Design a protein around this ligand. Structure first.
Ligand SMILES: [Cl-]
Ligand SMILES: [Cl-]
Ligand SMILES: [Mg+2]
Ligand SMILES: [Mg+2]
Ligand SMILES: [Zn+2]
Ligand SMILES: [Zn+2]
Length: 1143
């Protein structure tokens, strides 16, 4: 007696599936050793399919790809408020597989209501190659039976028989349930009346019977409730696990069911022959590129045309003519492309020169062509060159891509690969047929447009973004489970901090030595075991920020699809699964820096007429490196970390190569090589190769650029290629083998190395130890192509900041204009840098942030209630008529139709109309002048010339000037942020008591005790209230009311609060403010001054130190108030501040 589960749910039924793919497959294997089979039938998706197939296939289990469809009562287009039912589907052959793929796709793309649903219509369309089973209690037929509508159930049975023929089976499952008794009894009748054959399943959701509770809390994590609710999501019993053929019999007795339901199980599983194109199989699906041009000829064409643009001084028309005579501009390239490979190798046998460039380009093209990848390159070059001609910024390159001269020639890549030491062989290894990966950075604003270009260009049914599936982190798993079990957040957080973090992410609960915490409480015994039972599980299905597939044939033929919440078409398979089916996968990355460099160029142009051509800038500009050397890395790509900033100031880089090496080495591990780099860079330590005297002739040319240190992987490859005589491609393989650290296969390369090492130069004593140096530095060796390409963006960023500091800042503002916190921050950066940031102004402002002379000026679009049509209207009216002469002139030129009263109000409050006088006066003047303006047109559209049609605008309706609080209040309402001032700076009473400023918090607190308490004072901005200084804001647990706050810091948690009037009531203390410049004979000058006026006010001292501002409260001395006047009667500044003690 055997049995094969055909209705089993995995971790891929994301809401209720608890069976991990691995331990499920071993449990099936350990139960049934003979011809084991398992069907993956997940709730309305095909996510697991590929990984399930490849895990089961390598375990000797026969996988069966299945689908528990949600089937709509009527049509999949229904958005009816019947519902939807279940249906078990299995693919018996590959056409079956494909049809599942289409159905699963269509369920999401056409039929998604609450769940992804399909039709009996579309089922009928895609029924070929499918076995169907009557389904669980939630399915149509059993459901009808429960409702006493036997007529509908038989009618539906007929409908399905008309669809699937003899591939329809009556599905019979039994848990203790009383509904199952009634359903199965009637199902049994149907099965015998139509001669249908019953198949036993039991709808698994966990692996073993013990997993029932683990699964029950899983549901409580989706249901987001306590273990005791009730009404919390629960299954009807604890039976939904992978049962032994014996346990199955206990539910389905022999003297009542017979052998048929069991025998049919094994028979179906046998007749389910589905194979995926993986590993042994796998075809490369390269999409076709339209072009009397070969795919290989045109890539050649574009390369020759490219070099001429790329190396103007050394690759010219004259040069090409010579090469052809050694056997229009475009006509020569077109000709050179045809030259065959038998012809080419008859010229070589007869510093980067013209001839050198040809050879490298010709070599790369040779390798590309032979491997069958010219089509791949064409596709990539096409969409990148589109994006350029279409106002979409493109990075100089990423990853190994920039190592190819071809890539660089045809504009895939934008850094000179042979100027820097970049290697083609690191990108494509000539000695291994493997598809290259070309990732590309775009402006993060425009990236989607590039994807859209591809979608249109290659076909809507052939292009989708790749899906991603977050794993459940060990820490997060513990917290989620602990919630459910009714455990207080805090003691749970202490349990989560026990788990080690070895590389960014926490360690599996499998390993995790303070486990004696389980021994104490039996509650936590479960929590910990349950959390490791739920560890491997999945969250939901996001889009990959970068993944894109261009398939050769319609996607739905091999890979199922989805559509995310923003309408993006998404793959149901992940990164790897897609790639393991041999599909062309690209990365289109959104990059901030690119988007920033665009606004910079735009603003620069408008500011001073300069056309910033980033790809034509000199790379040896002094003022750029001097700025990096000063450590002014504030907005500079790649090097903004606290530590990194310090390192750049230390290094004082002078050429781009310093940036490349600095970025490569600054990370845990190589970090240590930087001091050495610096002393050698400063010209205060010789660079010596004495340990390899015979290898020096090879080592110097490679490692000189980087002061003897092997920093780059490319540097190693070259060393091994020159010393050992290795092919540069083989040196690549070597670096892979250094990285794998294969037990003793490393000793094979050793002997091979020394062989070629002797044969070349080194006496082999050096060789063995030189290989020791390689294996040492190959652990932390960096990919130079990636480093170099990125470094260029850093430079470009810094260069702008060096030469155009104001526009730089205005671009930083522009780029993050929708973030009130960042905008506030950037303003305070600019203001404390010499650059004034001004409120908008109807006469000078452009639409966005603008630089006038040497100031940054807010745009009109920045004003809160003003539409976008209105902002442009104002500007366009100002361009056809002159600058606005007065408020009246403004109101008659722009009717209320366009700039409504609400809009006008904000515009005043912003300061956009400040050129017309007092604001309070302007606000009041509005409605009278609106009446006036409306009345002018009445006379105007009733004849009346110009004197008869205008009793020219009355004076400004008078009112008292606004106070600072109310004026600043209006600004914020109108601009989101305060410009020129902050409400808190009006009453410095709070400033003085505050133990800190918002900015200084992190810096001040870190070094103190464990989880300290602190007092902060600022403004309130929430109906989790937000507190704000003139220095920043904070989350802390109504508006325009100042508060002092006592709170705990780890995030900030409030414990006590006092109002402005409360603080100004608590007894006051004298605070003197002393500079660092104070004599010995003062600290007893000041000391005696206070000694002579006793009382009971504590004395505080603000000591503005060299780095930081200390707060020394005095000692014994207690002044008696009068001392303030007599103390300000000398070179000392003083204040009567509220006493810090009370709070
Ligand atoms: Cl060395
Ligand atoms: Cl060294
Ligand atoms: Mg049906
Ligand atoms: Mg990629
Ligand atoms: Zn389920
Ligand atoms: Zn099910």
């Amino acid at each position: 007696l055997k049995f094969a589960h055909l209705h089993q749910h995995t971790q891929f039924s994301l809401l209720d599936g608890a069976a991990k793919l691995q331990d499920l497959l071993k449990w099936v294997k350990e139960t049934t050793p003979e011809d084991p089979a398992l069907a993956m039938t997940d709730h309305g998706n095909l996510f697991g399919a590929v990984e399930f197939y490849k895990k089961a296939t390598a375990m000797g289990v026969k996988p069966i790809i299945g689908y528990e469809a949600y089937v709509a009562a009527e049509s999949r287009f229904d958005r009816k408020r019947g519902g939807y039912f279940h249906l078990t589907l299995l693919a018996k052959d590959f056409t079956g597989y494909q049809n599942l793929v289409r159905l699963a796709s269509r369920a999401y793309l056409e039929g998604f209501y609450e769940k992804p649903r399909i039709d009996r219509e579309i089922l009928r369309e895609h029924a070929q190659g499918l076995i169907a089973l009557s389904g669980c209690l939630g399915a149509e037929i059993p459901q009808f039976i429960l409702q006493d509508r036997l007529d509908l159930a038989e009618a539906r049975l007929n409908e399905d028989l008309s669809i699937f023929g003899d591939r329809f089976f009556i599905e019979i499952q039994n848990h203790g349930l009383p509904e199952q008794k009634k359903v199965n009894q009637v199902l049994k009748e149907f099965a015998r009346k139509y001669g249908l054959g019953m198949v036993a399943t039991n709808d698994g959701h966990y692996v073993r019977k013990e997993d029932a509770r683990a699964h029950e809390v899983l549901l409580a994590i989706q249901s987001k409730t306590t273990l005791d609710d009730p009404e919390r999501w629960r299954f009807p019993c604890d039976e939904f696990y992978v049962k032994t053929p014996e346990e199955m019999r206990a539910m389905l007795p022999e003297a009542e069911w017979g052998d048929e339901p069991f025998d049919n199980t094994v028979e179906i599983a046998r007749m389910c022959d589905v194979d995926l194109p993986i590993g042994d199989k796998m075809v490369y699906r390269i999409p076709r590129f339209p072009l009397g041009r070969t795919e290989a000829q045109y890539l050649r064409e574009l390369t020759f045309l490219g070099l001429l643009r790329r190396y103007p001084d050394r690759i010219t028309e004259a040069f090409y003519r010579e090469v052809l005579r050694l056997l229009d501009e475009r006509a020569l390239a077109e000709a050179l492309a045809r030259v065959e490979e038998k012809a080419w190798e008859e010229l070589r046998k007869r510093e980067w020169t013209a001839e050198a460039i040809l050879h490298r380009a010709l070599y790369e093209l040779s390798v590309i062509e032979r491997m069958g990848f010219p089509g791949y390159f064409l596709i990539v070059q096409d969409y990148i060159n589109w994006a350029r001609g279409h106002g979409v910024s493109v990075g100089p390159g990423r990853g190994s891509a920039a190592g190819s001269l071809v890539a660089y020639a045809v504009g895939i890549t934008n850094i000179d690969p042979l100027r820097f030491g970049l290697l083609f062989e690191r990108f494509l290894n000539p000695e291994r047929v493997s598809m290259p990966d070309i990732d590309t950075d775009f402006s993060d604003r425009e990236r989607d447009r590039v994807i859209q270009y591809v979608r249109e260009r290659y076909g809507e049914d052939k292009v989708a973004q790749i899906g991603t599936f977050g794993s459940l982190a060990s820490k997060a798993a513990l917290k989620d489970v602990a919630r459910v079990y009714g455990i207080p957040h805090k003691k749970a957080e202490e349990l989560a901090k026990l788990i080690p973090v070895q590389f960014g992410k926490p360690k599996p609960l499998q390993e995790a030595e303070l486990r004696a915490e389980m021994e104490k409480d039996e509650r936590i015994r479960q929590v910990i075991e349950v959390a490791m039972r739920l560890e491997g599980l999945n969250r939901h299905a996001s889009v990959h920020a970068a993944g894109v597939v261009i398939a050769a044939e319609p996607l739905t033929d091999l890979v199922p699809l989805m559509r995310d919440q923003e309408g993006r078409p998404v793959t149901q398979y992940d990164m790897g699964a897609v790639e393991a089916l041999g599909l062309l996968k690209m990365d289109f990355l959104g990059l901030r820096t690119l988007t920033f460099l665009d606004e910079a160029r735009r603003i620069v142009k408008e500011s001073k007429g300069v056309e910033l051509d980033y790809d034509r800038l000199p790379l040896d500009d002094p003022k750029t490196f001097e700025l990096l050397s000063r450590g002014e890395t504030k907005g500079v790509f790649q090097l903004e970390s606290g530590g990194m900033t310090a390192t750049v100031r230390g290094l004082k880089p002078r050429r781009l190569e310093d940036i490349i090496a600095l970025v490569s080495l600054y990370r845990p591990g190589p970090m240590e090589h930087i001091p050495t780099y610096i002393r050698r860079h400063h010209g205060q330590e010789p660079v010596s190769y004495a340990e390899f005297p015979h290898a020096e002739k090879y080592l110097r040319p490679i490692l000189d650029e980087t002061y003897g240190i092997p920093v780059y992987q490319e540097q190693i490859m070259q060393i091994a290629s020159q010393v050992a005589g290795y092919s540069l491609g083989e040196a690549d393989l070597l670096r892979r083998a250094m990285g794998k650290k294969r037990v003793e296969e490393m000793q094979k390369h050793r002997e091979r190395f020394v062989r070629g090492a002797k044969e070349r130069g080194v006496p082999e004593e050096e060789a063995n130890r030189l290989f020791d140096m390689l294996e040492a530095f190959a652990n932390y060796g960096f990919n130079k192509s990636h480093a170099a390409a990125y470094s260029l963006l850093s430079y470009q960023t810094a260069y702008v900041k060096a030469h155009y500091p104001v526009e730089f800042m205005a671009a930083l503002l522009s780029v993050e204009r929708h973030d009130s916190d960042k905008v506030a921050e950037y303003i305070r950066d600019a203001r404390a840098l010499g650059i004034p940031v001004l409120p908008p102004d109807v006469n000078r402002s452009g639409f966005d942030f603008k630089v006038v002379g040497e100031e940054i000026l807010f745009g009109l679009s920045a004003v809160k209630n003003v539409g976008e049509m209105a902002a442009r209207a104002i500007l366009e009216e100002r361009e056809r008529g002159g600058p606005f002469k007065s408020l009246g002139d403004f109101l008659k030129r722009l009717p209320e139709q366009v700039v409504n009263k609400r809009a006008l109000e904000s515009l005043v409050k912003a300061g956009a109309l400040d050129a017309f006088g007092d604001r309070a006066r302007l606000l009041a003047s509005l409605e009278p002048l609106l009446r006036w303006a409306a009345e002018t047109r009445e006379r105007g559209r009733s004849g009346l010339v110009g004197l008869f049609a205008e009793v020219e605008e009355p004076p400004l309706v008078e009112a008292s000037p606004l106070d600072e609080i109310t004026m600043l209040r209006y600004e914020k309402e109108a601009l989101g942020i305060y410009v020129s001032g902050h409400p808190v700076l009006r009453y410095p009473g709070l400033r003085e008591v505050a133990s800190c400023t918002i900015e200084e918090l992190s810096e001040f607190v870190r070094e103190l005790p464990g989880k300290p308490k602190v007092l902060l004072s600022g403004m309130v901005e929430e109906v989790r209230f937000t507190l704000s200084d003139e220095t920043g804001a904070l989350e802390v647990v109504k508006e325009d009311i100042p508060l002092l706050v006592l709170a705990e810091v780890e995030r900030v948690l409030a414990q006590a609060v006092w109002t402005l009037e409360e603080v100004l009531e608590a007894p006051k203390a004298l605070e003197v403010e002393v500079d660092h410049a104070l004599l010995d004979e003062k600290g007893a000058r000041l000391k005696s001054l206070l000694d002579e006026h006793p009382g009971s006010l504590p004395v505080y001292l603000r000591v503005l130190g060299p780095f930081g501002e200390a707060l020394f409260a005095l000692r014994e001395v207690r002044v008696g108030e009068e001392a303030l006047g007599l103390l300000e009667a000398e070179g000392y500044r003083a204040y009567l501040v509220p006493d810090r003690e009370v709070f």
